[PDB]
Design an enzyme around this catalytic site. Sequence first.
Site, PDB file in Angstrom:
ATOM      1  N   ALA A 184      -2.311   3.838  -2.546  1.00 32.77           N
ATOM      2  CA  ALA A 184      -2.232   4.425  -1.206  1.00 32.77           C
ATOM      3  C   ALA A 184      -3.037   5.701  -1.165  1.00 32.77           C
ATOM      4  CB  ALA A 184      -0.783   4.744  -0.865  1.00 32.77           C
ATOM      5  N   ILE A 214       0.920  -1.105   0.000  1.00 33.23           N
ATOM      6  CA  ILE A 214       0.000   0.000   0.000  1.00 33.23           C
ATOM      7  C   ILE A 214       0.983   1.180   0.000  1.00 33.23           C
ATOM      8  CG2 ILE A 214      -2.227   0.741   0.921  1.00 33.23           C
ATOM      9  CD1 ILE A 214      -2.068  -1.674   2.810  1.00 33.23           C
ATOM     10  N   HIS A 215       1.265   1.613  -1.235  1.00 38.05           N
ATOM     11  CA  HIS A 215       2.165   2.713  -1.592  1.00 38.05           C
ATOM     12  C   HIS A 215       1.510   3.318  -2.849  1.00 38.05           C
ATOM     13  CE1 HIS A 215       5.289   0.691   0.928  1.00 38.05           C
ATOM     14  NE2 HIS A 215       4.528  -0.344   0.612  1.00 38.05           N
ATOM     15  N   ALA A 216       2.281   4.017  -3.676  1.00 38.22           N
ATOM     16  CA  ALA A 216       1.726   4.610  -4.892  1.00 38.22           C
ATOM     17  C   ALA A 216       0.260   5.089  -4.742  1.00 38.22           C
ATOM     18  CB  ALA A 216       1.844   3.610  -6.052  1.00 38.22           C
TER      19      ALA A 216
END
Lengths: 275, 275, 87, 87
Positions: free
Chosen positions: D18, D13-15
Amino acid sequence: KKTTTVGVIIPDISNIFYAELARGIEDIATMYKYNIILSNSDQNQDKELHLLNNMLGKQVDGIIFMSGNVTEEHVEELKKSPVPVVLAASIESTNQIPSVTIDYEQAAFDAVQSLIDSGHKNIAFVSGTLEEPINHAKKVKGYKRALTESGLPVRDSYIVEGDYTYDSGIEAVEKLLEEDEKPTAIFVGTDEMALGVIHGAQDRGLNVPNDLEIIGFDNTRLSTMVRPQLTSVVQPMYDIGAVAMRLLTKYMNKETVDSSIVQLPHRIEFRQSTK
Amino acid sequence: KKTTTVGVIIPDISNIFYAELARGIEDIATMYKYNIILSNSDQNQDKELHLLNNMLGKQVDGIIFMSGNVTEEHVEELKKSPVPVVLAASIESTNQIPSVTIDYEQAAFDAVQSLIDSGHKNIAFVSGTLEEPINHAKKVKGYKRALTESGLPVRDSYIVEGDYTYDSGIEAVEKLLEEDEKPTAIFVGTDEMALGVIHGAQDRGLNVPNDLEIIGFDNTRLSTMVRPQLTSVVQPMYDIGAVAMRLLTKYMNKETVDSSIVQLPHRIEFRQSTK
Amino acid sequence: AQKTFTVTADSGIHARPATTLVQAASKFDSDINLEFNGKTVNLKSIMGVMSLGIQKGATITISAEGSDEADALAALEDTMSKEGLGE
Amino acid sequence: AQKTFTVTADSGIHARPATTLVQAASKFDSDINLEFNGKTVNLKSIMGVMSLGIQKGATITISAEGSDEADALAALEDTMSKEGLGE
């Protein structure tokens, strides 16, 4: 009135293609002192159509817009726009809005036929989004025309269209090579859907151009970092930036514009996915 | 007064690294309604130092600045700046200016030592710009510390530094492997100077991790489009964008800032240049 | 009154290398120009250069004319070769 | 009062994935939260999520609390799985 600030609505500047396009823009809009108000479009008719309005509200003396499909209506708000708009590396039938881009039909065509003489029988296309008038009405157009014009089965299923990823570029080469009739060659738009294809067949054991003679599009740095290095179509992602703004500038600084619609040069850059 | 517009001075947004950094920024500065005035820095003390001034003149309620080396003075004009500045994925000793980035020492360290246990003897470093306090005082730092701390010859010439290209990433693996004492492994910052190295030794005939066990930095898409796929350090180019602005925003919208200096998480992403 | 060159940069005269010379050439005071295959546009312009699509190969020709020619032919010769261009 | 999940997206859960949920979660009216390994920050925040560095593997926990909980636990379950996240 005039704010010396030119907005621009580009899809996703995570995307290398569009990336080098900033530089394109950024780099001239500076020479010609205008702060560019970048703004990601994420390809979506409201994300586009709205976002614009503001370029306009927060008064900006022009707008170099981009899309992978500048739509019917789109033009209307665009034709309407009180400020100059100069479609970049994007396309729409009417020529109604200036538009700097490269010649997308023929380029498609050339590699195709310049595959065929490589003693080539059964060719193939692997492009993304068959919706984008940039694809179905252009790179296929040429993929097809040089193809027909030299009597060949234009096999409406010799063409599959994954998105614009490497992963899908391999995944297409698979489902295309699942087929009975195997391809002496392959075309591809996305510069990296080329690697998607080279390390694509190369993963199910198959040498290039040994087993397959591949080619593709853009020539962008990604066309070197592969073994074989990739033989592909040269388009100036930046250059489109450049001559885009210079052109808006020519419109924003009442200069006499030559052709409202341009198409910078394009050649073939054969590295190794071609013999 | 406050214009709801935040400038940003990033090196070259042709660069993928910095690219996904826009999105980082662009994408939150939108959530929090501020038009970002992009502006290429091209790493140059006047290109930097000047360009700033304007963010300031053309009043912008903040500035997320970036450099591969935010210099002594730099800070001064920065400490001075009447508007909030939030250094991103950049670094400078003093912590005087907020600064969102990832933990550059230890990350360097981990892969190095997490190479050594892979039954590893003679390791190596191949980073770019040994000037950038981001390199010589960090990725080498860690390259060295995990190295010394586990008694090993920290061979001050087991480290060569081409620019940030693929071409140089191969060209370094050469001049490093010209050497008598050949490396059981190699480290590298530039995510693509990894490919520069894999298809690097792989070109003078040498299997990976078969002949050499490689690793690198960023994990960015480029860490998939290779065979072997590249095993490297995970840093969130975008995430740095994200938490950068959110932070400037927290400063621009008088919110209580927790830590003025942050370092988002980092892990190892082993694909295949490691066994 | 000028020089003549043979483009060495494999990415011709595109990218900044392009926005690079249009630059220098911008400066001066002479009627600079780029002579590539018959065709030839003032060098003090971007489009013209970019439009001529000047890849890695051909012979190119500088075109200096006016009170500060010589100086250009040299700020430039020294310019493109400095930037991996013709020679 | 919530759910529980097992992160499936290999880029955690990044980019945007997110900036995607911080979003939905932004909306609502409840005291949402993300429970990852002991630690847990309101989901209505970016930093907190991003700061927890939530890779591909672990079990995560949604945390809904207030007049519109349930609705979130669902706009969201439907949200992240829609976006290649947990399940």
